[PDB]
Amino acid sequence: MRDLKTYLSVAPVISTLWFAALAGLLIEINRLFPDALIFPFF
Amino acid sequence: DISGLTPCKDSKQFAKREKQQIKKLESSLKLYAPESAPALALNAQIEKTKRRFDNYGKYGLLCGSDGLPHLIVNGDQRHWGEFITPGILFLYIAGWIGWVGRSYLIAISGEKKPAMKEIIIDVPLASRIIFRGFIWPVAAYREFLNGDLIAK
Amino acid sequence: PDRPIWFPGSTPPEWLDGSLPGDFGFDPLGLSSDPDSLKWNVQAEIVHCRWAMLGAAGIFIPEFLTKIGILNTPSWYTAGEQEYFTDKTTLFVVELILIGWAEGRRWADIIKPGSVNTDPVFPNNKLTGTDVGYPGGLWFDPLGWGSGSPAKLKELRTKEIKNGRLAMLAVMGAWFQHIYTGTGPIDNLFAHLADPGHATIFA
Amino acid sequence: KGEWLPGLASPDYLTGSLAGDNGFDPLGLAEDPENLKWFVQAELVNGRWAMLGVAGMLLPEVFTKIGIINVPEWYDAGKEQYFASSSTLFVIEFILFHYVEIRRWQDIKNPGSVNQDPIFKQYSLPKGEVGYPGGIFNPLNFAPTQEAKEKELANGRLAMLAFLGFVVQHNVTGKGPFENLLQHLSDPWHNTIVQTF
Numbered sequence: 001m002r003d004l005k006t007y008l009s010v011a012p013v014i015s016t017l018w019f020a021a022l023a024g025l026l027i028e029i030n031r032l033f034p035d036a037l038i039f040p041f042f
Numbered sequence: 043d044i045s046g047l048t049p050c051k052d053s054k055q056f057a058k059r060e061k062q063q064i065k066k067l068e069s070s071l072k073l074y075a076p077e078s079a080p081a082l083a084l085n086a087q088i089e090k091t092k093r094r095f096d097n098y099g100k101y102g103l104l105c106g107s108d109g110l111p112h113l114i115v116n117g118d119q120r121h122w123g124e125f126i127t128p129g130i131l132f133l134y135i136a137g138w139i140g141w142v143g144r145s146y147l148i149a150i151s152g153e154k155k156p157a158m159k160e161i162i163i164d165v166p167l168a169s170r171i172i173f174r175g176f177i178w179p180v181a182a183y184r185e186f187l188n189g190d191l192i193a194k
Numbered sequence: 195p196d197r198p199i200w201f202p203g204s205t206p207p208e209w210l211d212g213s214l215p216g217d218f219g220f221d222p223l224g225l226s227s228d229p230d231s232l233k234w235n236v237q238a239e240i241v242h243c244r245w246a247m248l249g250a251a252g253i254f255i256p257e258f259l260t261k262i263g264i265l266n267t268p269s270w271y272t273a274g275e276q277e278y279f280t281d282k283t284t285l286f287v288v289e290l291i292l293i294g295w296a297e298g299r300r301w302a303d304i305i306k307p308g309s310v311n312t313d314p315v316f317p318n319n320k321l322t323g324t325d326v327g328y329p330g331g332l333w334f335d336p337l338g339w340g341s342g343s344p345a346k347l348k349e350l351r352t353k354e355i356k357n358g359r360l361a362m363l364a365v366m367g368a369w370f371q372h373i374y375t376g377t378g379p380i381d382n383l384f385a386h387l388a389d390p391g392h393a394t395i396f397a
Numbered sequence: 398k399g400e401w402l403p404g405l406a407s408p409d410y411l412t413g414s415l416a417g418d419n420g421f422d423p424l425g426l427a428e429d430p431e432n433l434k435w436f437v438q439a440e441l442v443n444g445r446w447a448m449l450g451v452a453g454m455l456l457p458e459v460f461t462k463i464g465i466i467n468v469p470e471w472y473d474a475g476k477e478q479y480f481a482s483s484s485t486l487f488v489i490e491f492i493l494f495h496y497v498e499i500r501r502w503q504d505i506k507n508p509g510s511v512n513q514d515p516i517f518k519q520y521s522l523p524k525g526e527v528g529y530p531g532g533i534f535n536p537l538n539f540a541p542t543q544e545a546k547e548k549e550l551a552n553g554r555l556a557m558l559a560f561l562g563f564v565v566q567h568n569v570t571g572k573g574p575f576e577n578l579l580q581h582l583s584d585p586w587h588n589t590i591v592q593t594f
């Protein structure tokens with residue numbers, strides 16, 4: 001378990017997990033709000 | 043209004059462009075059966091286009107002569123939401139990221155071989171460091187005032 | 195050492211001794227090599243066992259009583275669809291706050307074994323538990339059946355753990371049976387008991 | 398002193414000497430003593446103003462709902478016409494606050510330096526701690542005991558939270574605070590935030 005956790009903390013794996021999470025969040029945000037060109041909340 | 047620009051609800055080329063897009067979509071829509079899924083998808087596309095044009099008209103942008111919206115980066119109070127507010131948001135996010143990275147680097151600099159910590163990140167320390175970026179402007183201002191920001 | 199194991203004739207893992215209640219040496223994936231992982235897994239298993247026991251009881255008692263003419267409760271699968279005196283969001287928020295207080299207390303107990311044994315408001319009331327996961331006290335052990343000889347305590351803990359495992363299996367079986375077949379679990383049991391051969395999963 | 402979160406060790410820099418100490422600093426802001434002093438003064442001022450603000454936007458609404466004096470709401474209090482234009486009042490406030498805040502800043506930088514009156518030289522403030530001038534500022538001669546400071550800090554924190562709630566719940570719902578509370582009390586289970594949207 002220690003060695004598996006150490007391997008999971010290597011740079012490419014952490015990078016791909018972080019970027020997958022970011023891409024998913026961005027895609028979901030763009031799906032909920034389809035188009036956006038200016039900031040209209042104010 | 044500004045630099046000879048017309049409000050986007052008044053302009054006629056905007057409505058002309060909307061008409062062309064709707065006609066182009068309906069040209070392909072006419073092929074499939076009414077009950078088929080492609081017809082539903084194309085109807086959803088048409089509704090999305092109409093909603094987008096309505097929102098663009100509502101938000102008060104200024105289309106030019108060609109009929110496309112233009113952005114004003116002067117700082118005029120009527121057009122602060124086009125550039126200035128997203129700029130502030132981006133600056134906040136970038137400062138957060140930079141502060142978190144610099145804090146992690148300084149934290150791991152103490153050990154004997156920081157290179158092995160860079161190539162193999164440690165998760166608990168980074169998790170502790172990450173949430174301190176929510177208050178990055180205050181910490182940066184105080185560190186600048188003290189004199190810990192710039193190396194000597 | 196000589197206790198029965200899950201696979202007779204095999205070698206139990208070194209990190210599984212047998213002192214823990216309900217220990218049979220079943221850990222082929224090595225998910226609890228680290229002692230801290232062992233503590234966390236034990237706490238999670240205990241919580242899961244208790245919650246699933248409550249869930250299995252609350253699923254299978256009203257359905258059986260509805261099979262008889264005593265009760266008229268609806269199906270457990272459609273319970274959330276019905277209407278109540280408040281919106282589901284408000285009930286969810288109130289439940290979230292209420293359960294969150296207790297879960298924070300339990301988390302504080304897990305992190306530090308002896309920091310939440312006293313009533314914050316009145317310092318007179320105390321909790322008499324001395325083991326993590328077994329709060330004890332008058333609130334969670336009014337009858338006093340908890341404290342006792344180590345052998346009796348281990349036997350009771352093993353009974354509870356086995357019942358909880360069976361309950362977890364029961365709840366997942368009920369969920370999968372309802373989604374696949376489309377009828378109440380008691381109906382499935384009666385139909386299978388009527389015709390043991392043909393009335394099975396292969397139908 | 399007390400622990401904000403049970404089971405969590407208090408930060409090493411917070412030793413409990415300061416009044417209103419509970420070890421609440423998860424983000425590590427007050428890791429330097431100078432930052433600690435500056436933030437102590439800032440927390441005093443932000444909150445000493447907040448109590449007055451909350452009272453000003455709360456009490457008149459209650460007294461008007463009773464039916465004694467008809468006063469405009471706190472959001473609409475700026476539209477009403479007064480004996481002078483808003484610009485003149487703003488300029489006067491700017492000048493006076495400039496003077497008093499520069500005096501306070503000079504007190505903070507060098508303690509015990511601006512105690513002396515600049516015009517009538519015979520009057521001076523008695524020596525004391527920073528942030529608690531005393532003297533003329535304490536006309537009733539109340540002892541600055543630690544318990545009073547703790548009560549003041551707790552009241553200030555509550556007032557800050559109340560002001561934030563006022564602002565947010567008036568932005569979301571166009572009505573005022575007291576009418577919002579009355580509406581919630583009319584039917585508690587169908588008037589919370591989650592009921593709206």
Ligand code: CLA
Pocket residue numbers: 140141142143144146163168171
């Ligand atoms: C750790 C954070 C970090 C920080 C705070 C800085 C800071 C800075 N960079 Mg450097 N840089 C970094 C990483 C970082 N860099 C990396 C990874 C590279 C290689 C791609 C470079 C290559 C680089 C160049 C080529 C230049 C700078 C320059 C600058 C300066 C101006 C800002 C700017 O132009 O951005 C420029 C930013 C980029 C080109 C990319 C950096 C953003 C990366 C993708 C993210 C870093 C995040 C990191 C992975 C976080 C890990 C922490 C986590 C484990 C907890 C400023 C001192 C400029 C300069 O010299 O100004 C005087 C410049 O010319 N940087």
Ligand code: CLA
Pocket residue numbers: 200210214215216217218219220221224225226235236237238239242359362363366367
């Ligand atoms: C619900 C979660 C759960 C959890 C956390 C545990 C946890 C534990 N078990 Mg228990 N156990 C469970 C349910 C669970 N059990 C069930 C349902 C049974 C009956 C089959 C048993 C029977 C059992 C035996 C016979 C033994 C243990 C033992 C242990 C301990 C060491 C093994 C371990 O590291 O597990 C950690 C486990 C996990 C992290 C859970 C998730 C694992 C993956 C992600 C799940 C894959 C899902 C699953 C395969 C899908 C099934 C679908 C469903 C419809 C059936 C530890 C306290 C050993 C012991 O020492 O006893 C004290 C041992 O000998 N358990």
Ligand code: CLA
Pocket residue numbers: 248249251252253255256267268273274276
């Ligand atoms: C482990 C957790 C657990 C959970 C989350 C639930 C969850 C629920 N229970 Mg179940 N239940 C459990 C364990 C659990 N039960 C156990 C161990 C038993 C055995 C005693 C039961 C026996 C049971 C009964 C006999 C009833 C429920 C009902 C309910 C449902 C709504 C009522 C409510 O929750 O108030 C807490 C619920 C109870 C503990 C019993 C009190 C009955 C409540 C107040 C509802 C009465 C409303 C009425 C029947 C509906 C119409 C009103 C009328 C004016 C028109 C909901 C699905 C009710 C239902 O079926 O609604 C759809 C209900 O009648 N449960």
Ligand code: CLA
Pocket residue numbers: 360363364366367368370371374375382383385386393394395396
């Ligand atoms: C926990 C006990 C348990 C019990 C008592 C039952 C009982 C029943 N199930 Mg099964 N089932 C279970 C677990 C259980 N199930 C689980 C966890 C799942 C999810 C994978 C299923 C999924 C399932 C489906 C999808 C269907 C049934 C069906 C049925 C009935 C016919 C038997 C059959 O065809 O085999 C099917 C059995 C399974 C796919 C796997 C069961 C094996 C698990 C590991 C049992 C372990 C329990 C224990 C050791 C055995 C005796 C229990 C006793 C001590 C109380 C029977 C009443 C069929 C039905 O509707 O009958 C008409 C049906 O269509 N079951």
Ligand SMILES: CC(/C=C/C=C(C)/C=C/[C@@]12O[C@]1(C)C[C@@H](O)CC2(C)C)=C\C=C\C=C(C)\C=C\C=C(C)\C=C\[C@@]12O[C@]1(C)C[C@@H](O)CC2(C)C
Pocket residue numbers: 177421422423424425426443444446447449450451453454470471472474475557558560561
């Ligand atoms: C000053 C203030 C309000 C002042 C209001 C005033 C003057 C109002 C004036 C008026 O109303 C009147 C009287 C009458 C009206 O007619 C006119 C106006 C003009 C409208 C609020 C401060 C409000 C201040 C607030 C809410 C501050 C909140 C801070 C928090 C929660 C910080 C938390 C943490 O920093 C800690 C403590 C430790 C870290 O480790 C972690 C984090 C989380 C970073």
Ligand SMILES: CC(=C/C=C\C=C(C)\C=C\C=C(C)\C=C\[C@@]12O[C@]1(C)C[C@@H](O)CC2(C)C)/C=C/C=C(C)/C=C/[C@@]12O[C@]1(C)C[C@@H](O)CC2(C)C
Pocket residue numbers: 220221222223224225242243245246248249250252253270271273361362363365366
């Ligand atoms: C908590 C839980 C678990 C279930 C079910 C949980 C199950 C089946 C868990 C199974 C785990 C397994 C098999 C793990 C196996 C292994 O990990 C080991 C042990 C060791 C490794 O070496 C090998 C592998 C294989 C990885 C279930 C809880 C259910 C609840 C509260 C239900 C509540 C309700 O019903 C009520 C009362 C009334 C309804 O109206 C509403 C709902 C809400 C529906």
